[model samples]
Target: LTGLCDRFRGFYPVVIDVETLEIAAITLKMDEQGWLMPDTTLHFHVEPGAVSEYEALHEIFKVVRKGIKASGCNRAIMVAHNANFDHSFMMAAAERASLKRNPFHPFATFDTAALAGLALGQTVLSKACQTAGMDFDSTQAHSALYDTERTAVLFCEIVNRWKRLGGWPLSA
Candidate 1:
């Protein structure tokens, strides 16, 4: 069977959630029914400009690099609700941390906001999840891990639904 990595043309889809300074990401994989699901999750609490922040970011970056390597993908494509915001922030943070090896693609991203807007008519994360018949907890909203996991679930649901609908061709 063709893998999910092929769907994005060698770029791995990694759902990312940025919390001003901290960040979290979850990589996607294809299951038996050709559905996208969360594979690996990475989260870091970065204290701006601190020595630990540099180490944390580098560590997370390393993990993401290894994840892409293991997946046999060329690069990780950041997938976020508002992709530009998260991707730009991640890029700036990595640069500022002197992280020369960034795993995510420099420009391209899969914006769940755009996908949800087009598919579910909902751009907000909570609304999109709700429309997709998924649960979202408002009380746990700003936590990096919580939001990242929820976003991952939302992303998987959307992609899985598309797969169920025979949207993307899996076999070449």
Candidate 2:
């Protein structure tokens, strides 16, 4: 993830990881990839070392916000199946969080929904996954970690098409 400054860290490496635990111990109703985590999750003790505190929201956001700040654009490129909904949710959440620093540009997004529709005419994640022959089960649709992995792979394909189609930025 040029976006993935997370997952692993060494004062010079990754930040977040795909296996960020189960996201179940906290009992919060929020979605997987983002938003906030309650004090319960923040304090749910993990390993005996510093990694115990690493799962907290502040700690996670520190890397997220830091990456955004370092990007010079002061913004993040949001990628999603439904960019409209996710981007709106992120903006609302950020406003509520009000940490005074954020990397995501509310309107700047790369939508797999848009890309998928042009290729298959059905933009829903379920249908898109089926079309791509990817693994997806309706029962597991909302798990943040589950969805994250599915979306991550889906985007890898969609983004390449995004560029081939003369989409924005047109990186060479």
Candidate 3:
């Protein structure tokens, strides 16, 4: 990681993965050591049968926009465990919102789940965490923030390990 990237070591990056009516948002919180720390929780409750998919997505994006504004950080990256799915949803949502595609398009994204599968040869986050000798909290699995934090930790470990083995930037 470049020094500029390293400066963001202790900051959190947004990780979003949406599933139809369920949108999962996570922040990859990191410690000074660049280890992913526990995440903060922020859940949006859109009443069932009360809104269309576009409306729900609009609301979600509104919340995300507000969050970015509040954070006062223009440079925010979105990391989706499964980039294809999440990115697709985000693009659709952005279109519906009449906004630009992804604001983070040109910037690189950090996919811990992908990293784990490629580097450690594991497909699932739980499996990767286990391989790393890390314990995952089962109760927090589906929750957006928790999953993001876990993914962040998993990504950090995989990246550090790969770097040590002279395998930085595992083929996307």
Best by TM-score: 1
Residue 126 error for model 3, in Å?
Answer: 2.4
Q: What digit string (tens of lDDT, one per residue) describes model 1 on residues 1-172?
A: 3566667788888888888667787877876656778888878777763336678667767777887787678888888988898888878877887888888889999999999998899999999999998888889888888998988998888877877787777554
Tens digit of lDDT per residue, candidate 2, span 1-172? 2222231111111111122332211111112332212211222223323343334334545555564445333334555666666556545544655546554455766676776787667798788877977888979875654665566556554544444465623242
Residue 63 accuracy (lDDT) in model 3:
54
Better of 2 and 3 by TM-score: 3
List TM-scores for all candidates, in order. Answer: 0.90, 0.55, 0.59
What's each prediction's clash count? Answer: 0, 10, 0
What is the Å distance of residue 33 in model 2 from its true position?
27
Candidate 1 has what TM-score? 0.90
Sorted on TM-score, highest at the top, how do the candidates line up?
1, 3, 2
**Of 2 and 3, which scores higher on lDDT?**
3
Q: Return the top candidate by lDDT.
A: 1
The best-first sequence of candidates by lDDT reads 1, 3, 2
